[model samples]
Target: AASKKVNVLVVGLDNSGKTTIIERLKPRPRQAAEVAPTVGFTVDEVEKGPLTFTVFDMSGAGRYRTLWEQYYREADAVVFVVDSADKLRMVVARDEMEHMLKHSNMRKVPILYFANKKDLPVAMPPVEIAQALGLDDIKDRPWQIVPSNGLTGEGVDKGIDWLAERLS
Candidate 1:
């Protein structure tokens, strides 16, 4: 039987490990130092279990923010990567995240929040990150926050597992 195809919009603030998430997911992972900030949006595909994910890793820069809405029409789900070690920027991430959730097209789509950089010494836990992002207030759709480390590939599979369940 053929696996189902799913489109996921991967987004977060700059330097929030969005690129690293994709690189780590690759069979031949790229070196950390070689991972550069994405200029706009890049599409990468990964197969897990019975699903083939078409992931759209969007740029987190200011100018590229506007480009995000254009892709919402195609997104089956959303993976919002966050830098848990970055406390100050979490506010900005939260604001944009709220806006992303409010889009009419995305209202019913499931969202998987990746609290990236959990390997950092100062990294915040998933619960704290959720509170900071006001995730508790959300009631329109299904969402889950998974703590992850892009460099070590920790929690990435767990996230995908959760997504697979939601999508089924």
Candidate 2:
């Protein structure tokens, strides 16, 4: 798009594949033997077609959860990932989503959701995941939830494609 770099906040519940999805977005993905749990946050730069993104990979751990809100004002967009196979914690993710949306800075930023871990048999469909997240309730900003597999980077492009379109 333009010359300005986009600030993308990657957030969701712990183990929802936030880091994994971001890792797969790398131009030459450096395979990690295993991804360690994020304690605070991490940063990386990724190119989504013409959109150059500066990603803020925030930890979803209970303790550091509060830190995400601080970055909202600067975020050009948000990537909210969810482990579709993890049903129990789904509502907690929703709570965080609600909180993110309630923040003043989040009023108009576009949000992209990856209903991740679809490789698992228990994974829910993206439409159902959207229902679970109450996505229809969001009318202020553009958003989309696509089925994705973080391990294989499936559907990642669509998420970024939508983000790029919305950003432009």
Candidate 3:
């Protein structure tokens, strides 16, 4: 049988809840929690109707950032998940976003910024995150700034819905 799938490149610093994001998005059994940075890539497959997503969850370390560009050629779009509760880590997030923009093989590849952890008391709003990212320029790209709390499954589908809409 033929299949349809999309590739969503998920990138963010350590503990930004990339794995948790996946755990929230799909139907699966609950398991023991773990907290280790994804090494090369973890391509999670999701199916809905004729659509499937090979969600490419990538590493968050500085050194690993270099390896991401190599995979851009295959990505359908990018999803930048941010830990909205941490102020200091936001700087690292900025650097990573800037790095991707400067080295982006596909500038118009449709980027979606997930201001994750909204359920956290300290999580920043999407607008605040946009300002933090110097989004004045980023806004010019095909993008959406969405609030998502992967831990409790709040707003997960909404963020994924945005991604699904622009998959073409």
Model 1 RMSD in Å is: 1.7
lDDT for every model?
A: 0.87, 0.88, 0.79
Candidate 3: C-alpha RMSD after superposition: 2.1
Better of 2 and 3 by TM-score: 2
Q: What is the lDDT of residue 16 in candidate 3?
A: 84
Mind sharing the TM-score for model 1? 0.93
RMSD of each: 1.7, 1.6, 2.1
What would the TM-scores of all predictions be? Answer: 0.93, 0.94, 0.88
Residue 116 alpha-carbon offset, candidate 1, angstroms? 0.7
Error of 3 at 135 (Å): 2.1
Among residues 3 or more apart in sequence or in different chains, the pairs in candidate 1 whose N, CA or C atoms overlap within 3 Å are none
Candidate with better lDDT, 1 vs 3: 1
Candidate 3 global CA lDDT score: 0.79
**Ranking 1 against 3 by TM-score, winner:** 1
Name the candidate, 1 or 2, with the larger lDDT value: 2
lDDT of 1: 0.87
Summarize candidate 1's per-residue lDDT along 25-100 as a digit string, tens digits: 7776434457778989888888777888898989999899988988888899998999999999888999999788
lDDT at position 110, candidate 1? 86
Where is model 3 more than 4 Å wrong at Cα?
30-35
- Output the lDDT of residue 46, model 2: 80
lDDT tens readout by residue for model 3, 1-168: 355767778888877888788877677574326546778677677775557888888887777777778767787888888999988888889998888877747456788888888888988888989888887786556788889888776877887777777874
Tens digits of per-residue lDDT, candidate 2, 60-107, equal 899999999989999999999899998888889999899899888765
